[PDB]
Write a protein that binds this ligand. Structure first.
Ligand SMILES: Nc1nc2c(ncn2[C@@H]2O[C@H](COP(=O)(O)OP(=O)(O)O)[C@@H](O)[C@H]2O)c(=O)[nH]1
Ligand SMILES: [Mg+2]
Length: 165
């Protein structure tokens, strides 16, 4: 039973918790304490392959945190489409991941969340441009409506598979 270790990173309030819960528990969480960091596991079938997702929802001493940075195989870098600052913060996250992994080639997906909202300040092109700049996928999601939620997580799994060959 093959296991994939994922880490969800990004600025506070982007929807890291909501996304993880939406994937795992299949519901939208209205309020989840921002200070809580925890791991969640689920057995899933991705592209005909049954596997175990092991995801850390970051809030940012914890040995669990340390282990996931060390052993985690792929990172969701999350911003919100209505939060310019959060998009601006993305590069910070990437540099942290690069350092921890000691590698330019770490499996990652840029996720633009809250795309159910009209109040959009980060346009598709901007995020695609950044994604292409890093050579990673960009995926637009809504935790509230489930739009692209499995896609974001499954894409990252596919990024990991590439790295493993
Ligand atoms: N409209 C909308 N609200 C969202 C979405 N994702 C999260 N939220 C809300 O944004 C707030 C912060 O989300 P949370 O998951 O706690 O973000 P975190 O701090 O990054 O873990 C909460 O009020 C969530 O219900 C989404 O896709 N659409
Ligand atoms: Mg949270």
């Amino acid at each position: 039973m093959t296991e994939y270790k994922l880490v969800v990173v990004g600025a506070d309030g982007v929807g890291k918790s909501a996304l993880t819960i939406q994937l795992i528990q299949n519901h939208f969480v209205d309020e989840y304490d921002p200070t809580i960091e925890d791991s969640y596991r689920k057995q899933v079938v991705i592209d005909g392959e049954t596997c175990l997702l092991d995801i850390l929802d970051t809030a940012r001493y914890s040995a669990m945190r340390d282990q996931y940075m060390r052993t985690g195989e792929g990172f969701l870098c999350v911003f919100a489409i209505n939060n310019t600052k959060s998009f601006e913060d993305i590069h910070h996250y990437r540099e942290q991941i690069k350092r921890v992994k000691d590698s330019e080639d770490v499996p990652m997906v840029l996720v633009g969340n809250k795309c159910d909202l009209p109040s959009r300040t980060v346009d598709t092109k901007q995020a695609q441009d950044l994604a292409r700049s890093y050579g990673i996928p960009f995926i637009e999601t809504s935790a509230k409506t489930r739009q692209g939620v499995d896609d974001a997580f499954y894409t990252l799994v596919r990024e990991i598979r590439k790295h493993k060959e």
